[PDB]
């Protein structure tokens, strides 16, 4: 096959993407070993769905798991009566998700389970795939002529040919695995044929962070989670927290082999030590460095010029309310709170008005990083930690280090009940989620 | 009382020290709190016995403990039929130790239990005291005019008003306590009246090391465990392992307060950690620094000159045998071995000839420091770690860091069966001891 493995793509046909996917235990070969994973469509990752604005998506999910499941269309600003976080599909039953792709939308999204209390084991076991909304901006020559690849960043641990079970410490920290994979492959080689690469990046891990750096090269950020930036932004590295997406241009500077690495990053995970008094919690410290892939540049690379502009970011109306959402932890209990409470699907926590804009100040009073996700209503990050964000783009996950406040501008779009939660999915399963009702 | 607490002294009378001591649980005040310790003579430390060469010692030990006990006359080159490591005194019974102090002897010795398998809890709980053999060398003016003090270095931990029980990790590492005491007092003040101090130092701890340093001052070593050096040796610090003794002169240089500290020292103690894989053993690292006492210098101090010479060290006959004793560990089992075996009181390990000299090469193939002690037969340390020792003096404990070989010259003195063992007494109780028979 191609040197660089990527999920099989399913494209809409005549404006319609109509697909049946089964969620099923499936034996496959991964990373050189045989294992049984839980997959969509028989593969890990699941198939990439590729659509255009105004397409209809009709996706029938057949549940062939031994427990209930559902889908979250992560990042899509659609109705929460479709992207329904409270729906349960029982074992053996099916449900059809049908929606229209919004007109003003572009970027890399993804789909995965969202059945409260069971997300972390289901996502860890292999249930996820990407959704790409292609744009008329993809026709500008500086993007059209780039070589495009999707990179699904997802780690795994195997025991006895199956995904390793969650331990109590995994529920506290979020589970990370020793197999650090790209598109389900272990350290694949990308032999570039063009000097400019357009890489769509997805962190579909439960909890692992990827502090991305390409040896000898900057990255040019052109899209965040939910849409394009206004112009490319040069960065020396790019941190992708669980659930985040980014698109970058890589301008290969000379022939050679360059490693794409996940550099050391300390997200605040904890271990336990006994040194005579004790036992007491102790920081794990930064992750060990990982090589994600080997990038081989072509001969005599001459990259395209960067695009001067991408998409202007919308002018938003003045906001009508400011909200404050404080994140705290009880690590030894593995319980996680928003404003002092754990999720309860019967309780509405915030009530807002469709088509108004809100300012959300989300404050991490814990010691771990927490990547905060809001369904249905993409947001503009204004500042995090008191530092203004250096670009304007739609996001739907924002990472908070210990102590930091993020200030978000949140236009409320579709009416209905939806949720916001930490995207360390173990923390969501363990309570760090609340309910927003938009009317 | 005097600003500097020291154990009460019992002196021989007319050439005879005849004393009844009871080993008993005794309520006392220590470090500002009430506790019940196991004591000799009603005190912690026990009374200091002070004798001269050729004195007779007649000590009746009455056992008022709930378990058997005995005495080891640590460092005295007397008969192992008196200093009998196999003798058991049952609860409520008494035994009289009677011996003559050897003619060619001087220094600081001590007494403590040596009933195999029960040493560590009995010593930790308070059962120990010092024995001083005074010398005609003490009359030379450079020692006579010095101010003399004994410093018994011994730590403790209390729980519920009693010595803290041993945990499994204590049996592996040797138990250290958070109360780091001098003569049973917490950080006492020594207000010096003379400019030269002669300090007798005893490490009577189960396992704690004392890396001794006096602020702003060197120490002048004048005696090791079992006798004088040939001349004073200037040192910037002095490591005293469990069971070791030293005598030093301190020459106070100016008015002021100087701390005597136990500086950080890593003896190889281990803890346990769980960081996601695990649980696995991890080094504790160096001890935290401790202040042992506050030393107040007098006004306008003018120290005496040092003695030019002390005692010539004996010329020993050429040795007739070389022995090799290899120390190893099974830390997770808390088992400790010499040449692959644990102690067995029925098994003789070495057979030597009285009045010959032997070379013992003791090799630490473990990762912890081990302070190796031989009963009855004081030795001359030639080298440790391949470094020649910088002085000649009688020792009876030699500390080995991980990997190090000590080469000892061992004149065999009294006939009979005796033992050698680690003086981390938990390691002796857990097997690191063997039997020497001299005939
Ligand atoms: Cu998600
Ligand atoms: Cu969600
Ligand atoms: Cu979290
Ligand atoms: Cu001893
Ligand atoms: Cu002994
Ligand atoms: Cu030892
Ligand atoms: Na299938
Ligand atoms: Na008593």
Domains in chain B (CATH in brackets) are: 1-134 (2.60.40.420), 135-311 (2.60.40.420), 312-439 (2.60.40.420)
Q: How far is residue B297's CA from residue A94's CA, in Å, rounded to a whole number?
A: 88
- Residue position matching structure tokens 């009378």: B13
Rounded-to-integer distance, Cα B406 and Cα B428, Å: 19
- List the single residue in B169, B273, B278 with the smallest CB-CB distance to A276: B169
Residue with tokens 């959402």: A325
> Taking Cα atoms as reference points, which of B39, B9, B13, B12 lies closest to residue B26?
B39
Query: What resolution does the deposited structure have, in angstroms?
Result: 1.8
Query: Is residue A206 a contact partner of residue A167, using CB atoms and an 8 Å limit?
Result: no
Contact B45, B94 (CB under 8 A): no
- CA–CA distance, A380 with A389 (Å, rounded to integer): 9
Q: Which ligand is nearest to the CA of A24?
A: 7
Q: What angle do CA A400, A401, A403 make, to 5 degrees?
A: 100
Bond into B229 cis (ω within 30):
no
Pairing of strands A9-11, A48-51: parallel
Nearest to A169 among B173, B276, B282 (CB): B276
Of A423, A421, A418, the C-alpha closest to A431 is A421
What separation in Å is there between the alpha carbon of A438 and the centre of ligand 3? 24
Asked if B274 lies within 8 A of A278 by C-beta distance, the reply is no
Supply the DSSP symbol for B136. Answer: G
DSSP reduced 3-state for B73 = strand
Determine the distance separating the centroid of ligand 3 and the alpha carbon of A382, expressed in angstroms.
Answer: 21
Calpha distance A382→A313 (Å, rounded): 13
Of A160, A126, A158, the C-alpha closest to A47 is A126
Distance CA A76, CA A107 (A): 10
Cα angle for residues A389, A394, A399 (degrees, 5° grid): 55
The rounded distance, in Å, linking the Cα atoms of B301 and B211 is 26
Which residue is closest to B273 within chain A, CA to CA?
A273
The DSSP bridge partners found for residue B72 are B112
Nearest residue in A to B283, CA atom: A275
What does the alpha-carbon distance between residue B217 and residue A182 come to, in Å, rounded to a whole number? 62
**Is A272 close to B271, i.e. CB distance below 8 A?**
no
Max Cα distance, chain A (Å)? 69
Residues 6 or more apart whose Cβ sits within 8 Å of residue B280: B272, B273, B274
Give CA–CA dist B394/B230, Å, rounded. 11
- Give chain B positions within 8 Å (CB) of A276: 169, 173, 176, 269, 271, 284
* Alpha-carbon distance values, B83 to A106, B89, B120 (Å): 89, 13, 18
Q: Which residues contact A315 (CB under 8 A, 6 or more apart)?
A: none
DSSP letters spanning B25-46:
EEEEEETTEEEEEEEETTBSSP
Residue A231, phi then psi, degrees to nearest 5:
-160, 160
Ligand 8 centroid distance, CA of B23 (Å): 6
- CA distances from residue B425 to A63, B301, B387 in whole angstroms, order as listed: 64, 41, 27
Q: Which tokens hold the place of A138?
A: 């993809």
Residue B273 to residue A278, Cβ atoms within 8 A: no
A154 vs A180: CA distance, rounded Å = 6
* Nearest by CB: B284 against A173, A272, A275: A275
The per-residue b/e assignment along A35-63, b for 16 or more CB within 10 angstroms, e otherwise, is: bbbbbbbebbbbbbbbbbeebebebebbb
Give φ, ψ of B227 to 5 degrees. Answer: 170, 175
What does the block give as tokens for A412?
A: 């409320």
Look up tokens 């020396």; give the residue. Answer: A236
User: How far is the CA of B327 from the CAs of B59, B335, B368, B431, in angstroms?
Assistant: 35, 11, 10, 11
Q: Where are the beta strands (DSSP E) in B252-298?
A: 256-263, 270-274, 280-283, 290-297
Specify whether the CB–CB gap between A170 and B275 falls below 8 A: no
Residues of B in contact with A273 (CB under 8 A): 271-274, 282
| CB of B228 closer than 8 Å to CB of B398 | no
Determine how many CB atoms are found less than 10 A away from the CB of residue B92.
Answer: 10
Instruction: Determine the distance in angstroms separating the CA of B207 from the nearest CA of chain A, rounded to an integer.
Output: 13
Neighbours of ion ligand 5 (CB under 5 A): B 72, 114
Q: Is B421 annotated as a binding residue?
A: yes
CA B178 to ligand 8 centroid distance, Å: 26
What count of other Cβ atoms lies within 10 Å of the Cβ of residue B67?
15
Helix, strand, coil distribution of chain B in percent, nearest 5: 5, 50, 45
Residues of B in Cβ contact (< 8 Å) with A272: 273-274
| Sequence-ordered list of residues with C-beta below 8 angstroms from that of B136, at least 6 positions apart, any chain | none
- B274 neighbourhood in chain A, CB within 8 Å: 169, 271-273
DSSP state of B242: T
Across B53-188, where does the E strand assignment appear?
A: 56-63, 72-74, 94-100, 107-112, 129-133, 147-156, 158-159, 162-163, 179-182, 185-186
Residues in chain A closer than 8 A to B272 (CB atoms): 273-274
> What is each CA distance from B146 to A217, A421, B181, B248, in whole angstroms?
73, 74, 24, 11
Residue A423 Cα, ligand 1 centroid: separation in angstroms? 7
Annotation-wise, does B377 bind a ligand?
Answer: no
Interface size, chain A vs chain B, as Cβ–Cβ contacts under 8 Å? 33
Quick one: which of B360, B347, B331 has its CA closest to B433?
Answer: B347
Taking the CA of residue A253 and the nearest CA in chain B, the distance in Å comes to: 40
Which ligand is closest in space to the CA of residue B62?
A: 8
Q: Are B55 and B12 in contact (CB under 8 A)?
A: yes
Span from the CA of B430 to the centroid of ligand 5 (angstroms) = 13
Cα–Cα–Cα angle for B327, B79, B411, rounded to 5 degrees: 55
Question: Which residue numbers of A have CB closer than 8 Å to B's CBs?
Answer: 169, 173, 176, 269, 271-276, 278, 282, 284
Between CA A24 and CA A127 the distance in angstroms is 9
Q: Tell me the C-alpha distance between B417 and A49, whole Å.
A: 85
First-last CA distance in chain B: 50
Q: What angle do CA B227, B233, B235 make, to 5 degrees?
A: 115
Both tokens assigned to B340: 């692959």
**8-state DSSP, B100:** E
Among B317, B212, B298, which Cα is nearest to B256's? B298
Picking from A169, A269, A275, the nearest residue to B271 by CB comes out as A275
- Centre of ligand 1 to C-alpha A112, Å, is 6
- Min distance A126 CA to chain B CA atoms (Å): 21
Q: How many CB atoms lie within 10 A of CB B240?
A: 24
B400: left (phi over 0), alpha (psi -120 to 50) or beta: beta
Q: How far is B281 from chain A (nearest CA, A)?
A: 10
Chain B CA closest to residue A169: B276
Cβ-contact A117, A234 below 8 angstroms: no
B255: closest CA among B192, B188, B198? B192
In whole angstroms, how far apart are CA B288 and each of A131, B211, B282, B285, B291? 56, 11, 17, 9, 10
Q: Measure Cα distances from A395 to A85, A135, A350, B145 in Å.
A: 19, 17, 20, 83
Chain centroid to Cα B252, Å, comes to 26
Cα B425 to middle of ligand 3, angstroms? 48
Question: Does residue B169 come out as left (phi exceeding 0), alpha (psi in the -120 to 50 range) or beta?
Answer: alpha
* B345 is an annotated ligand-binding site residue: no
Tell me how the structure was determined. Answer: X-ray
Q: Is B112 annotated as a binding residue?
A: yes
DSSP state of B332: G
Nearest to B272 by CA among B264, B282, B285: B282
Residue with tokens 């003045």, as numbered in its chain: A318
Task: Report chain B residues touching chain A, CB-CB < 8 A.
Answer: 169, 173, 176, 269, 271-276, 278, 282, 284
Cβ atoms of A397 and A243 closer than 8 Å: yes
Among candidate residues A263, A239, A270, the one with its CA nearest the CA of residue A170: A270
What is the distance between the terminal CA atoms of chain A, rounded to a whole angstrom? 50
Helix (H) or strand (E) holding B169: helix B168-173
- Residue B87 DSSP symbol: -
Tokens matching residue B166? 């041993």
Containing B124, the helix (H) or strand (E) segment is helix B119-124
Which residues 6+ apart lie within 8 Å of B437 measured at CB? B348, B350, B351, B352, B416, B417, B418
Q: How far apart are CA B415 and CA A230, in angstroms?
A: 94
* DSSP collapsed to 3 states, chain A: CCCCCCCCEEECECCEEEEEEEEEEEEEEECCEEEEEEEECCECCCCEEEECCCCEEEEEEEECCCCCECCEEECCCCCCCCCCCCCCECCCCEEEEEEECCCCCCEEEEEECCCCCCHHHHHHCCCCEEEEECCHHHHCHHHHCCEEEEEEEEEECEECCEECCCCHHHHHHCCCCCEEEECCEECCEEECCCCEEEEEEEECCCCCCEEEEECCECEEEEECCCCEEEEEEEECCEEECCCCEEEEEEECCCCEEEEEEEECCCCCCEEEEECCCCCEEEECCCCCCEEEEEEEECCCCCCCCCCCCCCCCCCCCCCCEEEEEEEEEEHHHCEEEECCECCCCCCCCEEECCCCEEEEEEEECCCCCEEEEECCCCEEEEEECCEECCCCCEECEEEECCCCEEEEEEECCCCEEEEEEECCHHHHHCCCEEEEEEC
C-alpha distance from A26 to closest chain B C-alpha (Å) = 27
CA angle B349, B355, B358 (to 5 degrees): 50
Task: Report the separation in Å between the CA atom of B39 and the middle of ligand 8, taken as the mean of its atom positions.
Answer: 7
CB crowding B133-167: b at 16 or more within 10 Å, else e? bbbebeeeebbeebbbbbbbbbbbebeeeebbebe
List the B228-235 sheet strands across, edge first.
Answer: B185-186, B179-182, B147-156, B196-203, B245-251, B219-223, B228-235
């Amino acid at each position: 096959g191609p040197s660089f493995p990527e999920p099989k793509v399913v494209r809409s046909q005549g404006g319609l993407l109509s697909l049946k996917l089964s969620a099923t235990p499936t034996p496959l070969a991964i990373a050189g070993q045989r294992a049984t994973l839980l997959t969509y469509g028989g593969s890990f990752p699941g198939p990439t769905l590729r659509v255009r604005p105004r397409d209809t998506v009709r996706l029938t999910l057949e549940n062939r798991l031994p427990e209930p499941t559902n889908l979250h269309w992560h990042g899509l600003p659609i109705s929460p009566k479709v992207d329904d976080p409270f729906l349960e599909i029982p074992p053996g039953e099916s449900w059809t998700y049908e929606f229209t792709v919004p007109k003003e939308l572009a970027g890399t999204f993804w789909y995965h389970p969202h059945l409260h209390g069971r997300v972390a084991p289901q996502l860890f076991a292999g249930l996820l795939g990407a959704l790409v909304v292609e744009s008329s901006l993809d026709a500008i020559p500086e993007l059209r002529e780039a070589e495009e690849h999707l990179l699904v960043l997802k780690d795994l641990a195997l025991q006895g040919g199956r995904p390793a079970p969650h331990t109590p410490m995994d529920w506290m920290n979020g589970k990370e695995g020793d197999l650090v994979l790209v598109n389900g492959a272990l350290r694949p080689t990308l032999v570039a044929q063009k000097a400019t690469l357009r890489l769509r990046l997805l962190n579909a891990s439960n909890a692992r962070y990827y502090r991305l750096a390409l040896q000898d090269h900057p990255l040019y950020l052109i899209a965040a989670d939910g849409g394009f930036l206004e112009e490319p932004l040069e960065v020396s590295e790019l941190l992708l927290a669980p659930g985040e997406r980014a698109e970058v241009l890589v301008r290969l500077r000379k022939e050679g082999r360059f490693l794409l690495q996940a550099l050391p990053y300390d997200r605040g995970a904890m271990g336990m030590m006994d040194m005579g008094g004790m036992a007491h919690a102790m920081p794990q410290g930064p992750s060990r460095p990982e090589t994600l892939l080997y990038l081989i540049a072509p001969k005599n690379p001459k990259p395209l010029p960067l695009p001067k502009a991408l998409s202007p970011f919308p002018t938003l109306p003045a906001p009508v309310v400011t909200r404050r959402l404080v994140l705290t932890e009880d690590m030894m209990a593995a319980r996680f709170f928003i404003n002092g409470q754990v999720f309860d699907h019967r309780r509405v926590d915030l009530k807002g008005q469709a088509q108004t804009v809100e300012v959300w100040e989300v404050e991490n009073q814990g010691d771990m990083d927490h990547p905060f996700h809001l369904h249905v209503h993409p947001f503009q990050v204004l500042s995090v930690g008191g530092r203004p964000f250096p670009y304007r783009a739609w996001k739907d996950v924002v990472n908070l280090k210990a102590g930091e406040v993020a200030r978000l501008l949140v236009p409320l779009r579709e009416k209905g009940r939806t949720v916001f939660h930490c995207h360390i999915v173990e923390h969501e399963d363990r309570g760090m989620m609340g309910v927003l009702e938009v009317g």
